[PDB]
Design an enzyme around this catalytic site. Sequence first.
Site, PDB file in Angstrom:
ATOM      1  N   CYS A   1      34.064  43.297  43.337  1.00 19.95           N
ATOM      2  CA  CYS A   1      35.347  43.266  42.628  1.00 19.95           C
ATOM      3  C   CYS A   1      35.223  43.481  41.134  1.00 19.95           C
ATOM      4  O   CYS A   1      34.573  42.713  40.436  1.00 19.95           O
ATOM      5  CB  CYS A   1      36.065  41.927  42.873  1.00 19.95           C
ATOM      6  SG  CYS A   1      37.717  41.871  42.119  1.00 19.95           S
TER       7      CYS A   1
ATOM      8  N   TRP B   1      46.374  43.258  41.753  1.00 17.51           N
ATOM      9  CA  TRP B   1      47.165  44.444  41.418  1.00 17.51           C
ATOM     10  C   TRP B   1      46.182  45.614  41.428  1.00 17.51           C
ATOM     11  O   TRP B   1      44.970  45.429  41.284  1.00 17.51           O
ATOM     12  CB  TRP B   1      47.853  44.318  40.052  1.00 17.51           C
ATOM     13  CG  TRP B   1      46.950  43.914  38.951  1.00 17.51           C
ATOM     14  CD1 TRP B   1      46.096  44.714  38.254  1.00 17.51           C
ATOM     15  CD2 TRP B   1      46.809  42.598  38.411  1.00 17.51           C
ATOM     16  NE1 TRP B   1      45.429  43.980  37.310  1.00 17.51           N
ATOM     17  CE2 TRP B   1      45.847  42.675  37.382  1.00 17.51           C
ATOM     18  CE3 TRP B   1      47.404  41.357  38.698  1.00 17.51           C
ATOM     19  CZ2 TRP B   1      45.461  41.558  36.628  1.00 17.51           C
ATOM     20  CZ3 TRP B   1      47.019  40.235  37.945  1.00 17.51           C
ATOM     21  CH2 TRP B   1      46.058  40.348  36.923  1.00 17.51           C
TER      22      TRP B   1
ATOM     23  N   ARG C   1      37.314  40.749  38.323  1.00 20.77           N
ATOM     24  CA  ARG C   1      37.005  39.332  38.243  1.00 20.77           C
ATOM     25  C   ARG C   1      37.212  38.624  36.919  1.00 20.77           C
ATOM     26  O   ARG C   1      37.067  37.409  36.867  1.00 20.77           O
ATOM     27  CB  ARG C   1      35.589  39.069  38.761  1.00 20.77           C
ATOM     28  CG  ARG C   1      35.457  39.185  40.283  1.00 20.77           C
ATOM     29  CD  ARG C   1      34.007  39.046  40.693  1.00 20.77           C
ATOM     30  NE  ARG C   1      33.229  40.266  40.481  1.00 20.77           N
ATOM     31  CZ  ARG C   1      31.901  40.294  40.509  1.00 20.77           C
ATOM     32  NH1 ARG C   1      31.238  39.163  40.717  1.00 20.77           N
ATOM     33  NH2 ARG C   1      31.232  41.439  40.374  1.00 20.77           N
TER      34      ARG C   1
ATOM     35  N   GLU D   1      42.274  53.669  42.987  1.00 21.63           N
ATOM     36  CA  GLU D   1      42.287  53.257  44.396  1.00 21.63           C
ATOM     37  C   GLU D   1      43.300  54.093  45.176  1.00 21.63           C
ATOM     38  O   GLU D   1      43.055  54.521  46.309  1.00 21.63           O
ATOM     39  CB  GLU D   1      42.684  51.781  44.535  1.00 21.63           C
ATOM     40  CG  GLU D   1      41.714  50.780  43.901  1.00 21.63           C
ATOM     41  CD  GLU D   1      42.183  49.338  44.056  1.00 21.63           C
ATOM     42  OE1 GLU D   1      42.159  48.826  45.188  1.00 21.63           O
ATOM     43  OE2 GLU D   1      42.580  48.715  43.049  1.00 21.63           O
TER      44      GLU D   1
HETATM   45  C1  HEM Z   1      44.058  40.904  40.027  1.00 20.10           C
HETATM   46  C2  HEM Z   1      43.501  42.141  40.017  1.00 20.10           C
HETATM   47  C3  HEM Z   1      42.440  42.624  40.799  1.00 20.10           C
HETATM   48  C4  HEM Z   1      41.846  43.810  40.534  1.00 20.10           C
HETATM   49  C5  HEM Z   1      42.172  44.819  39.418  1.00 20.10           C
HETATM   50  C6  HEM Z   1      40.804  43.985  41.505  1.00 20.10           C
HETATM   51  C7  HEM Z   1      40.085  45.182  41.696  1.00 20.10           C
HETATM   52  C8  HEM Z   1      39.237  45.497  42.793  1.00 20.10           C
HETATM   53  C9  HEM Z   1      38.817  46.837  43.183  1.00 20.10           C
HETATM   54  C10 HEM Z   1      39.134  48.129  42.444  1.00 20.10           C
HETATM   55  C11 HEM Z   1      38.118  46.727  44.354  1.00 20.10           C
HETATM   56  C12 HEM Z   1      37.640  47.835  45.260  1.00 20.10           C
HETATM   57  C13 HEM Z   1      38.709  48.156  46.303  1.00 20.10           C
HETATM   58  C14 HEM Z   1      38.288  49.256  47.273  1.00 20.10           C
HETATM   59  O1  HEM Z   1      37.560  50.184  46.852  1.00 20.10           O
HETATM   60  O2  HEM Z   1      38.705  49.193  48.448  1.00 20.10           O
HETATM   61  C15 HEM Z   1      38.105  45.318  44.668  1.00 20.10           C
HETATM   62  C16 HEM Z   1      37.397  44.778  45.734  1.00 20.10           C
HETATM   63  C17 HEM Z   1      37.312  43.400  46.042  1.00 20.10           C
HETATM   64  N1  HEM Z   1      38.001  42.387  45.369  1.00 20.10           N
HETATM   65 FE1  HEM Z   1      39.287  42.603  43.759  1.00 20.10          FE
HETATM   66  N2  HEM Z   1      40.737  42.894  42.339  1.00 20.10           N
HETATM   67  C18 HEM Z   1      41.733  42.060  41.965  1.00 20.10           C
HETATM   68  C19 HEM Z   1      41.990  40.833  42.629  1.00 20.10           C
HETATM   69  C20 HEM Z   1      41.211  40.226  43.636  1.00 20.10           C
HETATM   70  C21 HEM Z   1      41.454  38.901  44.151  1.00 20.10           C
HETATM   71  C22 HEM Z   1      42.650  38.006  43.782  1.00 20.10           C
HETATM   72  C23 HEM Z   1      40.394  38.659  45.022  1.00 20.10           C
HETATM   73  C24 HEM Z   1      40.192  37.558  45.849  1.00 20.10           C
HETATM   74  C25 HEM Z   1      40.639  36.304  45.567  1.00 20.10           C
HETATM   75  C26 HEM Z   1      39.524  39.797  44.975  1.00 20.10           C
HETATM   76  C27 HEM Z   1      38.334  39.990  45.787  1.00 20.10           C
HETATM   77  C28 HEM Z   1      37.687  41.206  46.032  1.00 20.10           C
HETATM   78  C29 HEM Z   1      36.745  41.476  47.107  1.00 20.10           C
HETATM   79  C30 HEM Z   1      36.103  40.402  48.001  1.00 20.10           C
HETATM   80  C31 HEM Z   1      36.537  42.858  47.128  1.00 20.10           C
HETATM   81  C32 HEM Z   1      35.725  43.706  48.097  1.00 20.10           C
HETATM   82  C33 HEM Z   1      36.600  43.991  49.311  1.00 20.10           C
HETATM   83  C34 HEM Z   1      35.915  44.881  50.335  1.00 20.10           C
HETATM   84  O3  HEM Z   1      34.694  44.694  50.549  1.00 20.10           O
HETATM   85  O4  HEM Z   1      36.603  45.749  50.922  1.00 20.10           O
HETATM   86  N3  HEM Z   1      40.053  40.757  44.158  1.00 20.10           N
HETATM   87  N4  HEM Z   1      38.821  44.582  43.732  1.00 20.10           N
HETATM   88  N1  LIG Z   2      43.062  45.951  43.459  1.00 19.79           N
HETATM   89  C1  LIG Z   2      43.022  45.441  44.664  1.00 19.79           C
HETATM   90  N2  LIG Z   2      43.407  44.190  44.849  1.00 19.79           N
HETATM   91  N3  LIG Z   2      42.588  46.197  45.680  1.00 19.79           N
HETATM   92  C2  LIG Z   2      42.482  45.780  47.089  1.00 19.79           C
HETATM   93  C3  LIG Z   2      42.000  46.933  47.971  1.00 19.79           C
HETATM   94  C4  LIG Z   2      43.108  47.967  48.137  1.00 19.79           C
HETATM   95  C5  LIG Z   2      42.641  49.374  48.596  1.00 19.79           C
HETATM   96  N4  LIG Z   2      41.536  49.887  47.727  1.00 19.79           N
HETATM   97  C6  LIG Z   2      43.826  50.350  48.544  1.00 19.79           C
HETATM   98  O1  LIG Z   2      43.770  51.323  47.774  1.00 19.79           O
HETATM   99  O2  LIG Z   2      44.816  50.123  49.276  1.00 19.79           O
END
Ligand code: HEM
Ligand SMILES: NC(=[NH2+])NCCC[C@H](N)C(=O)O
Lengths: 411, 409
Positions: free
Chosen positions: B108, B280, B111, B285
């Site tokens: 992520c 968000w 974070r 993405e």
């Molecule tokens: C608030 C703004 C947030 C942003 C900008 C953000 C951004 C991202 C991005 C760009 C990815 C990659 C998505 C993909 O390629 O499918 C990601 C993956 C991930 N995020 Fe975040 N995230 C946010 C919130 C969260 C929250 C609230 C959680 C959990 C409480 C979280 C947990 C994770 C996890 C575990 C992954 C990997 C998921 C997977 O393996 O498919 N994220 N995030």
């Molecule tokens: N910024 C996030 N919370 N991403 C969650 C994964 C969403 C996914 N990559 C999509 O384009 O639908």
Amino acid sequence: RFLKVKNWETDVVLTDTLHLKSTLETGCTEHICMGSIMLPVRTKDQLFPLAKEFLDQYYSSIKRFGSKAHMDRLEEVNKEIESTSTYQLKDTELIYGAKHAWRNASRCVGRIQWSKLQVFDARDCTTAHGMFNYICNHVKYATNKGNLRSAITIFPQRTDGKHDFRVWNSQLIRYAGYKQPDGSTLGDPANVQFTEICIQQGWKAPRGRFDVLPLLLQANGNDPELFQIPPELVLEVPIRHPKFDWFKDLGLKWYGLPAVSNMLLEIGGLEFSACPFSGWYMGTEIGVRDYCDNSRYNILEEVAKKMDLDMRKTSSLWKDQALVEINIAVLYSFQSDKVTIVDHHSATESFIKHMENEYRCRGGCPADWVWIVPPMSGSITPVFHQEMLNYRLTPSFEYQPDPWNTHVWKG
Amino acid sequence: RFLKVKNWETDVVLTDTLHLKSTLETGCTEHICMGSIMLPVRTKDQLFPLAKEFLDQYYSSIKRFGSKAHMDRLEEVNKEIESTSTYQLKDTELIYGAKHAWRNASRCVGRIQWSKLQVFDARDCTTAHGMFNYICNHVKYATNKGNLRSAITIFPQRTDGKHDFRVWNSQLIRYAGYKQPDGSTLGDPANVQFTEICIQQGWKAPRGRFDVLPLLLQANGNDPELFQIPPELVLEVPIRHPKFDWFKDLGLKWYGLPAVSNMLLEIGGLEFSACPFSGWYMGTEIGVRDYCDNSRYNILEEVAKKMDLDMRKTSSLWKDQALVEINIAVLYSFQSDKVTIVDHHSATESFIKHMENEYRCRGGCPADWVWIVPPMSGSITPVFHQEMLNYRLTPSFEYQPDPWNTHVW
Ligand code: HEM
Ligand SMILES: NC(=[NH2+])NCCC[C@H](N)C(=O)O
Ligand code: HEM
Ligand SMILES: C[C@H](O)[C@H](O)C1=Nc2c(nc(N)[nH]c2=O)NC1
Ligand SMILES: C[C@H](O)[C@H](O)C1=Nc2c(nc(N)[nH]c2=O)NC1
Ligand SMILES: NC(=[NH2+])NCCC[C@H](N)C(=O)O
Ligand SMILES: [Zn+2]
């Protein structure tokens, strides 16, 4: 144990067995992955085993495994090792070894061409002037007036570690970098330290933005000597855009021949510390990294201004828009001048075919995803969606400390 | 022991000790790296140590490690496990754990916002309708009229594996995918299947390009049920271009709330199999992956055509040119309608800042480079030049088998 890799865009799954033939380490452990870390003399005791493994691989490749020639060669090498603490590779073995070091280079996306490498045997070289001559011939042969040909020149192997042959330049052809007293840098920032060494060694720097560096060559562990590559042998390409006429006014150009010259080639335990090799460029190397890295020529802003882009906020993606244009320009300029070059789409598509072929015919293909995926438009290239396994096979190309850090100056 | 990571653009070097507290495996070994591979009930004996580890880190965080409360708590949980063969976390522990699971998610890039997570404790839930209610509230709360707020809703933990809560959707809000007779695919190919399982369940599908899928909720182990999310709760954005008036003609749109719902949250050995969370979007993405992947909406050609670019040879970089315009469109559209979204430049810059904070305040930050570097303009973002160490810390978010490959109607 079998390991499978899947391509998520085509669901094609491949099985890797070749990783079992890996004995070297990666840097990772069961508890940590160091896949994104850039950088994660032998004795008889240890040399015999390495030589055998190699000769075994070699004789199996020519379909003579177990033959009399194979056994005689193993006996000959062992006698030589006990008798001299080393051994000399036959010409055929050297060629086989060089080609496979390339075939095993996990960070190289151009490996589909591995078997067509031209190998120049410079093991009879004894002096810096000799090295210069071999290098000039390599550059002319490889440049081939723009129709680039892959090649490698192999100088004498390491013996006691006190008589090393080294090419102090990081690439045979590269531009000087100069730190100005106001803190700015003229030319290529990546080569500032090496440029300072050249100047100290006596090089008269023209202090321009694209001055081709001189060769600083070390033979038999002696102090390095300066040589100027004949200008007529250095092919350069003026960079212009097919639509923007002001692009040419940026005064940009690059050399056509990329020749890494600071790596170490290991074959059957033997270490070739001076083994310059060249292929041809993939556009992004120049257009994305050399020109747009903040720590290299860093031309993004200037190109963005000329394009009159909204540079007030990153979300306008002005950097992205400009990056594409610069890369279109690099490819166009090279093609117009008929100088070999490959775009990242073409290069990565070919690597996927090469990879699949290698799995089928060899049982795998070690690949470093971090390096293989292009520095721009990653996911619109097939390699992004391809799972890869990275492991170290030998023969291989290795990193080695810059020579100025370890060399014992003789005066 | 101590590992160093360097940033090749800034020369800054950070030291990592936090990896030392790593417990789970990475998939790699000293002879092989699987860094680019997408996918590399407990007993009383297994649970005891996990709970101890967690409580130990929880109490250490509140500055009362080795206090009577700490000891008492450990003893209490110790007893509860011996009897019920499990335990219940205090609300404070649930919140701490969820926040840290996000804090530890190496893939992520968002974070930096980890500590602001809003946690909705839905452990008292018991049916599919109850789950639907909780999910609707999560969506409304998180959407917040376009001013998105991060949140996670946590349903009942695992017990015996036969009474598991699961959200069958991969995301709370996603578009349907149908296999046309044309051989092609209508809608989103990634969900072609799941769509079928719903249409099978009676879902009357409008069979359009962008049709919001229905929720399929599974409570207490029973079979799953369907529910339509109130359209007024699904904020969508029409995609247009700040310069190509024709762009809008393309007829594309995307939803504003990205809400991963198929993952499993592990806290102190306890497993929460239904824990949808949302934040968000980062522009790429949608624009790079959802729209341009060949196996997704695959809209590059069509866009390059409208731009009238020479698509005869790859070296004209038409694909790249179009890719950028599209992504400009996504960010413009979302920003126009005041729906929270972040560009990859801003997001990666913030992640670098977060890494540094984490290194100085925690001794490290697990990060998966392969996932952190955006799918476009990689080396133009600072994370490309940042060495990262990937390792597994707990609490954590783990992948889990699609329920329709484990259920039994
Ligand atoms: C608030 C703004 C947030 C942003 C900008 C953000 C951004 C991202 C991005 C760009 C990815 C990659 C998505 C993909 O390629 O499918 C990601 C993956 C991930 N995020 Fe975040 N995230 C946010 C919130 C969260 C929250 C609230 C959680 C959990 C409480 C979280 C947990 C994770 C996890 C575990 C992954 C990997 C998921 C997977 O393996 O498919 N994220 N995030
Ligand atoms: N910024 C996030 N919370 N991403 C969650 C994964 C969403 C996914 N990559 C999509 O384009 O639908
Ligand atoms: C024929 C054309 C070739 C192409 C298109 C090609 C392309 C590439 C590219 C794009 C990289 C990454 C460069 C960087 O990011 O700095 C690379 C790395 C590498 N290539 Fe090739 N290559 C070619 C030929 C060769 C040859 C002739 C050899 C060896 C005989 C070779 C050995 C390597 C090695 C060892 C690396 C890693 C270098 C490092 O760690 O800095 N390549 N190649
Ligand atoms: C830190 C990170 O490993 C480093 O910035 C990278 N360098 C390179 C890379 N890939 C290539 N081809 N060349 C690099 O120099 N991937 C990532
Ligand atoms: C094979 C490879 O691991 C796969 O294509 C990748 N997927 C993703 C990635 N990064 C992100 N953020 N999301 C992905 O789905 N990096 C590479
Ligand atoms: N394709 C090659 N042979 N590349 C060698 C490395 C050249 C280096 N990346 C450069 O931009 O100068
Ligand atoms: Zn690894």
